[PDB]
Amino acid sequence: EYPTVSEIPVGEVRLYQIADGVWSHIATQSFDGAVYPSNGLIVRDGDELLLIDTAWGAKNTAALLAEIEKQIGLPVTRAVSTHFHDDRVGGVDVLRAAGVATYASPSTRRLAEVEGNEIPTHSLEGLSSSGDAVRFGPVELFYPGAAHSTDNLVVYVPSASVLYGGCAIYELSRTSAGNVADADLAEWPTSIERIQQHYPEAQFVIPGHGLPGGLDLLKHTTNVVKAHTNR
Ligand SMILES: CC(C)Cc1sc(N)nc1C(=O)O
Ligand SMILES: [Zn+2]
Ligand SMILES: [Zn+2]
Secondary structure (H helix, E strand, O other): OOOOHHHOOOOOOEEEEEEOOEEEEEEEEEEOOEEEEEEEEEEEEOOEEEEEOOOOOHHHHHHHHHHHHHHOOOOEEEEEOOOOOHHHHOOHHHHHHOOOEEEEOHHHHHHHHHHOOOOOOEEOOOOOOOOOEEEEOOEEEEOOOOOOOOOOOEEEEHHHOEEEEEOOOOOOOOOOOOOOOOOOOOOHHHHHHHHHHHOOOOOEEEEOOOOOEOOHHHHHHHHHHHHHHHO
């Protein structure tokens, strides 16, 4: 059963097997007086592991590495952060210290710096324009355009038809907007439609926060976003 927010004390990290060689990682952290769960991805990359997003903070990200070592036992050699917020780059300094090469797009690295957040070391080329996709080991990185943030990326695992939507995709049970200070509400539905067109074969869809679903989460997120804008 996929772990829920109340089952994960702040500071602990769970791994969840999605498919052969594909895991989500789930952690918890406080934001504006409440604790929320947060997802990222782990993908086998030959004899190495590719990490998608930190576990939202240095302490959680340290627990993430320890849980990977305990449960999987292959080295995390690269990490991609899918936008500049703390649930994605919070913990980059820990990863770097542990020997992980950290990556993000130029926009993400720039926005992280502006915001005073941790900054991934290496720039990802080829993601500057809505609709751009690049291969990165066992995954494809896709920039769908502005949504939850102007820089948000999504990640697809072809070997397993896993789409990691990050914070641009909402879980089914989430019905209000939330952390949209940095969003482009008007562009968010268009960006989601690019995701639908590019990954129509996605079997598992992982939101940035909450329970995994299918492509139904895409239409679901667009409804929520609109409702926020309507009023
Ligand atoms: C209601 C919460 C999940 C809002 C939060 S907290 C956090 N770190 N991210 C978000 C988001 O909207 O992506
Ligand atoms: Zn965010
Ligand atoms: Zn988030």
